[PDB]
Structure 1
Amino acid sequence: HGMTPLHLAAKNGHDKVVQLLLKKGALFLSDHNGWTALHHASMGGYTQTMKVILDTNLKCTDRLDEDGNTALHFAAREGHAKAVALLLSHNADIVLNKQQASFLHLALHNKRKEVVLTIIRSKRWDECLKIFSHNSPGNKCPITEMIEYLPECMKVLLDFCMLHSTEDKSCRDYYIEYNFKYLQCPLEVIYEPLTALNAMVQNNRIELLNHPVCKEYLLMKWLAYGFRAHMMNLGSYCLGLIPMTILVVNIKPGMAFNSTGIINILDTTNSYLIKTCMILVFLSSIFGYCKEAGDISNVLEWIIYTTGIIFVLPLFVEIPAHLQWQCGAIAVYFYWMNFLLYLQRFENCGIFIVMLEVILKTLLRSTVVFIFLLLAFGLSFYILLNLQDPFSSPLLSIIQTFSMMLGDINYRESFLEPYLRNELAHPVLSFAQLVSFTIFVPIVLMNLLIGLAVGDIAEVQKHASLKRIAMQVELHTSLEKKLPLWFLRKVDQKSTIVYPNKPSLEMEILKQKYRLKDLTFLLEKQHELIKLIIQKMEIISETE
């Protein structure tokens, strides 16, 4: 393999023999695969050999092997933080590998925490951050790599970016400043709005997402554009939500009205308010239709807009009050139901909407068994209690069974009073069916629903904070993608001053596994050395 004895000495980390060779006319050559003595010293992590071999020519520091890797790449990959620091201090040159994997990338992919920390603490951290591949399928930006692989290194880096100054008592002298340089991708494809936040939320970095720097970044983006967009959306919806509420409250239902006033003698007392409210409702509905022109939410909005048009239709063409008020009831009900979904984009009400959605989904899943049970009990009660008004029709019977599911069994009026008056056709059968219904629906079905709901709520609460931050990040990312060029540069800060005074099992197990793997490797090397000792030692006394 063309291995020089100097290469062997550097590989096994023998400083004195390396010095003896270099002093007596040694030469720097390259073995097979393009390696050298510095590469072997980097692989073995012998800092003394590096410091002894580096100050003879100052020309082997930046040498490329057959794959293009340098000494820094091997030193960072093998986990030798001190060797990496020694190399970097001695004017090491950063060169991308033929694969386009830098030494920092190799350190991150092998999950070497101390090497990454030493690289960050180095005076050339920004330079090492600058060089990375912008188009390679792998080997992405270093910040994303440390977010994905080593959250603790990124936490330390952010605490370095914390910039906690003026630490002289709590006497309203704090001028703590937040820097946002590392939260923005440093390359400059497409421009992703929040690369760091998306990386954190994708990898479930809840501990990293809860850092004060990230929280303050989200808050600053909020006050920059998120609150403005949120207020705009809520005002656009309220412009039709509110006037409908005034129209409903100030007009007695079932009574016809138009722009002039109440027509069912004419009132002409709230005429201006009524006309303004219907004009606003019509304009908001037309605006919603236009925004639709240019999912459960879509159906909800379509029903809302259609019923809003029909409700305030007497603005131009008169209509019967019956249809008008049916559409008004439908419109107001669905208006507030849709405002419920409009509240989802908040940090205090979103989780409740998520819980409502999951419980509703479970109920819709169980509705088949529900309706089959209701059909059985309703038909039974319809045959058994046919002479009673609630069970006089099959549809009324199923509706009454649905009503009494919640435990409102009218035991006395429906069973006991007819029985004592000799009105039950089948007394024993009716009482047995009553006992069976009470055991089955209000006890068993309701207990099943309450257990399913307690499981759903627990599952949702497992990922509460992560979900909240995920919704906030998604909303801000969509808003950034909406505002193309100018508003971003107008509101981007990269810095903000805040006045506080107002004047863990998987990681530990993986660490243990790495320690055991290192022990195994060192034991193989030790066993090989002892076998060599037995092979090469000489015996002159006990030759048998």
Structure 2
Amino acid sequence: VALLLSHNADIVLNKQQASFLHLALHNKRKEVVLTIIRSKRWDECLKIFSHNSPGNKCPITEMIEYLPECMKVLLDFCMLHSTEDKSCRDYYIEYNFKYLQCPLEFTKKTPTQDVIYEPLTALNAMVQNNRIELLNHPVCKEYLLMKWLAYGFRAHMMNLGSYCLGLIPMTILVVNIKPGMAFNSTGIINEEILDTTNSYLIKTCMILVFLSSIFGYCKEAGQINYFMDISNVLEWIIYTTGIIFVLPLFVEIPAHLQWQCGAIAVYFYWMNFLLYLQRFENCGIFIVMLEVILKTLLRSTVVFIFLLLAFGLSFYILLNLQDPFSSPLLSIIQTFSMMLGDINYRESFLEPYLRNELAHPVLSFAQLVSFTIFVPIVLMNLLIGLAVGDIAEVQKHASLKRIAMQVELHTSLEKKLPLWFLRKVDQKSTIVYPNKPKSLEMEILKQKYRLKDLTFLLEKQHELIKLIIQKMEIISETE
């Protein structure tokens, strides 16, 4: 290949629109690909491919899919240094994002008739093939950081601000008025007396909550699969209750209803804030772990809610004269509370027994032992083991999942921004001053390929030897 390139050989496609680079990639010929890369004419070799072909795509995507160790060299070619002295401050590294851009750029014609390329093509190709060693290369890291500081940070701080604009005045209202008291824009109704100090803050916060609820209703009606999501339910509850909490801005309302809606709103607000936090990378793996553990726990209540029924309905009969067990529902809630080890042995079992107040002493003490064995020991250890397994499984894929979250974030953001804006904020390179403020499988695969080549050569040799025997001269050693 090097000899044929040194002479001016043409670079064309065939009947399958495959160039020689596609054939070298599909057969995992590493050395010829490295030769094509290290040479001149690499630019035309890169440009020669053609769209519309579901089998021979852009050379970069194919190189990511088949020979990632060559893509690593291709990326190493994109880090330029200055004085090559780590101590110098004018020593700066430049990163070039030449090969991560859209394939529709390489071709000169670019018809784009039926060809639509998704944003961040190279990084998505790396994610869909688990090329974690490529996603950690400094060029890709700087590419993602550039996208972030270019528009992602801003597009998400706007969302956080739009939510906090209703989240913060709610909390300010709660911790500044005594629960149970009626209040309107004029002040606090102390039943009638009217406390009027701090009325300005109260009015401002009541207006800011109302506007946020209205805009949330409008946005959600605009989005209206919908009822299936959980965020939709949470936000519907938040807006419906927050609009009632501050309703005395217009129409009177009983204080009981007002504060019983405030108690739900102030809880679901801060519970929904976690779904906003799960975007950022330093603190979004904990939300994944929390969700996994919560799902695993909820899938087992369909089973381990009959243990509670058994024990609660038996304790309702055995200990019926005591207040905690004086009703079926209260007796089931007390048994749920005793699940963590708070059994009240001395208050519910020993002291009534020494007063001759247990109707069934032997059964009551046998139930205590069987409960202690079954629920605070066996069931809780089962849950702990399940959680340990789930967290290990999540940690096994932490880095790839963390990077894929960011890639998907920016990919989704690109499909909604205007074209001219992306043109304006995008960059082609970056400059950095440092001073200023799975292997065993690959090995055995390679040696399998080597063994197959060995077999092929040995068979050719065997044929040659048989030819020798059938052509030679035999005179003195004839029979």
- Which TM-score bucket, shorter chain as reference? over 0.9
Q: Distance in 2 between matches of 1:105 and 1:179?
A: 25
Q: Distance in 2 between matches of 1:185 and 1:501?
A: 33
- The alpha-carbon deviation at position 174 of structure 1 amounts to 1.6
User: What's 1:110 paired with?
Assistant: 27
Answer whether contact 2:238 2:268 (CA < 8 A) is retained.
yes
- The alpha-carbon deviation at position 88 of structure 1 amounts to 1.2
Answer whether contact 2:95 2:429 (CA < 8 A) is retained.
yes
Q: Distance in 2 between matches of 1:175 and 1:209?
A: 22
Answer whether contact 2:104 2:117 (CA < 8 A) is retained.
no
- The alpha-carbon deviation at position 185 of structure 1 amounts to 2.4
Q: Larger Rg: 1 or 2?
A: 1
Instruction: Give secondary structure in 2 for the equivalent of 1:87.
Output: helix
Instruction: Give secondary structure in 1 for the equivalent of 2:187.
Output: coil
Q: Which moved more, 1:350-359 or 1:372-381?
A: 372-381
Q: Distance in 2 between matches of 1:526 and 1:138?
A: 36
Please say if 1:534 is aligned against 2:469. yes
User: What's 1:69 paired with?
Assistant: none
Answer whether contact 2:171 2:266 (CA < 8 A) is retained.
yes
Answer whether contact 2:181 2:255 (CA < 8 A) is retained.
yes
- The alpha-carbon deviation at position 190 of structure 1 amounts to 2.0
- The alpha-carbon deviation at position 173 of structure 1 amounts to 2.6
- The alpha-carbon deviation at position 414 of structure 1 amounts to 0.9
- The alpha-carbon deviation at position 326 of structure 1 amounts to 1.2
Answer whether contact 1:256 1:262 (CA < 8 A) is retained.
yes
What is the 5 A alignment of 1:65-464? 84-188=1-105, 189-264=115-190, 265-294=193-222, 295-464=229-398
Q: Distance in 2 between matches of 1:246 and 1:474?
A: 35
- The alpha-carbon deviation at position 165 of structure 1 amounts to 3.3
State the aligned residue count.
461
Return the TM-score normalized by structure 1.
Answer: 0.83
Instruction: Give secondary structure in 2 for the equivalent of 1:405.
Output: helix
- The alpha-carbon deviation at position 344 of structure 1 amounts to 0.4
Q: Kindly provide the CA deviation profile for residues 453-478 of structure 1, in whole angstroms up to 9, marking residues without a partner as x.
A: 00000000000011110110000001
Answer whether contact 1:130 1:187 (CA < 8 A) is retained.
no
Q: Distance in 1 between matches of 2:353 and 2:11?
A: 95
Answer whether contact 1:132 1:140 (CA < 8 A) is retained.
yes
| Structure 1 residues 173 and 448: alpha-carbon distance in aligned structure 2, compared to 1, 3 A threshold | same
- The alpha-carbon deviation at position 318 of structure 1 amounts to 1.1
Q: Distance in 2 between matches of 1:320 and 1:284?
A: 23
Q: Distance in 2 between matches of 1:413 and 1:270?
A: 49
- The alpha-carbon deviation at position 501 of structure 1 amounts to 1.2
Aligned alpha-carbon RMSD (Å): 1.1
Q: Distance in 1 between matches of 2:76 and 2:330?
A: 67
- The alpha-carbon deviation at position 131 of structure 1 amounts to 1.5
Q: Kindly provide the CA deviation profile for residues 365-384 of structure 1, in whole angstroms up to 9, marking residues without a partner as x.
A: 11112211111111111111
Answer whether contact 2:182 2:189 (CA < 8 A) is retained.
yes
Instruction: Give secondary structure in 1 for the equivalent of 2:102.
Output: coil
- The alpha-carbon deviation at position 169 of structure 1 amounts to 4.1
Instruction: Give secondary structure in 2 for the equivalent of 1:135.
Output: coil
Q: Distance in 1 between matches of 2:74 and 2:347?
A: 73
Q: Which moved more, 1:131-140 or 1:185-194?
A: 185-194
Q: Kindly provide the CA deviation profile for residues 367-410 of structure 1, in whole angstroms up to 9, marking residues without a partner as x.
A: 11221111111111111111111111111111111111111111
Q: Kindly provide the CA deviation profile for residues 308-356 of structure 1, in whole angstroms up to 9, marking residues without a partner as x.
A: 1111111111111111111111111110111011100011111000000
Q: Which moved more, 1:528-537 or 1:205-214?
A: 528-537
Answer whether contact 2:315 2:325 (CA < 8 A) is retained.
yes
Answer whether contact 1:206 1:466 (CA < 8 A) is retained.
yes
- The alpha-carbon deviation at position 116 of structure 1 amounts to 1.2
- The alpha-carbon deviation at position 522 of structure 1 amounts to 1.1
Instruction: Give secondary structure in 2 for the equivalent of 1:241.
Output: helix
Q: Percent identity?
A: 100
- The alpha-carbon deviation at position 433 of structure 1 amounts to 0.7
Q: Kindly provide the CA deviation profile for residues 264-299 of structure 1, in whole angstroms up to 9, marking residues without a partner as x.
A: 311111111111111111111111111112201110
Instruction: Give secondary structure in 2 for the equivalent of 1:496.
Output: strand
Answer whether contact 2:65 2:125 (CA < 8 A) is retained.
yes
Instruction: Give secondary structure in 2 for the equivalent of 1:506.
Output: helix
Q: Kindly provide the CA deviation profile for residues 414-450 of structure 1, in whole angstroms up to 9, marking residues without a partner as x.
A: 1111111111111111111111111011101110000
Q: Which moved more, 1:201-210 or 1:529-538?
A: 529-538
- The alpha-carbon deviation at position 145 of structure 1 amounts to 0.6
What is the 5 A alignment of 1:11-26? none
Answer whether contact 1:176 1:499 (CA < 8 A) is retained.
yes
- The alpha-carbon deviation at position 509 of structure 1 amounts to 1.5
Instruction: Give secondary structure in 2 for the equivalent of 1:250.
Output: coil
Q: Distance in 2 between matches of 1:385 and 1:191?
A: 70
Answer whether contact 1:119 1:125 (CA < 8 A) is retained.
yes
Answer whether contact 2:102 2:117 (CA < 8 A) is retained.
no
Answer whether contact 2:68 2:134 (CA < 8 A) is retained.
yes
Answer whether contact 2:33 2:70 (CA < 8 A) is retained.
yes
Q: Distance in 1 between matches of 2:338 and 2:12?
A: 76
Q: Distance in 1 between matches of 2:169 and 2:453?
A: 72
Q: 1:498 aligns with which of 432, 445, 453?
A: 432
Return the TM-score normalized by structure 2.
Answer: 0.95
Answer whether contact 2:209 2:246 (CA < 8 A) is retained.
yes
Q: Distance in 1 between matches of 2:102 and 2:421?
A: 19
Q: Kindly provide the CA deviation profile for residues 188-240 of structure 1, in whole angstroms up to 9, marking residues without a partner as x.
A: 32241110110011101111101000011000000000000110000000000
Q: Distance in 2 between matches of 1:190 and 1:484?
A: 16
Q: Distance in 2 between matches of 1:433 and 1:425?
A: 14
- The alpha-carbon deviation at position 172 of structure 1 amounts to 1.5
Q: Distance in 2 between matches of 1:289 and 1:124?
A: 59
Instruction: Give secondary structure in 2 for the equivalent of 1:262.
Output: strand
Q: Distance in 2 between matches of 1:287 and 1:85?
A: 65
Instruction: Give secondary structure in 1 for the equivalent of 2:95.
Output: strand
Instruction: Give secondary structure in 1 for the equivalent of 2:194.
Output: coil
Q: Distance in 2 between matches of 1:187 and 1:98?
A: 22
Q: Distance in 2 between matches of 1:165 and 1:394?
A: 79
Q: Distance in 2 between matches of 1:369 and 1:410?
A: 26
Q: Kindly provide the CA deviation profile for residues 474-504 of structure 1, in whole angstroms up to 9, marking residues without a partner as x.
A: 0000111110312211111111101111162
Q: Which moved more, 1:479-488 or 1:444-453?
A: 479-488
Instruction: Give secondary structure in 2 for the equivalent of 1:263.
Output: strand
Answer whether contact 1:141 1:185 (CA < 8 A) is retained.
no
Q: Distance in 2 between matches of 1:286 and 1:540?
A: 109
Answer whether contact 1:304 1:331 (CA < 8 A) is retained.
yes
Q: Distance in 2 between matches of 1:541 and 1:320?
A: 125
Answer 1 or 2: higher relative contact order, Cα 8 Å, separation at least 6: 2
Instruction: Give secondary structure in 1 for the equivalent of 2:189.
Output: coil
User: What's 1:15 paired with?
Assistant: none
Q: Distance in 2 between matches of 1:322 and 1:119?
A: 78
Q: Distance in 1 between matches of 2:418 and 2:473?
A: 80
Q: Distance in 2 between matches of 1:360 and 1:277?
A: 34
Can you give the 5+ residue segments of structure 2 that lack an aligned partner in the other structure? 106-114, 223-228
Instruction: Give secondary structure in 2 for the equivalent of 1:266.
Output: strand
Answer whether contact 1:166 1:176 (CA < 8 A) is retained.
no
Answer whether contact 2:28 2:66 (CA < 8 A) is retained.
yes
Can you give the 5+ residue segments of structure 1 that lack an aligned partner in the other structure? 1-83
Structure 1 ranges of 4+ moved more than 3 A:
none
Answer whether contact 1:151 1:208 (CA < 8 A) is retained.
yes
Answer whether contact 1:130 1:186 (CA < 8 A) is retained.
no
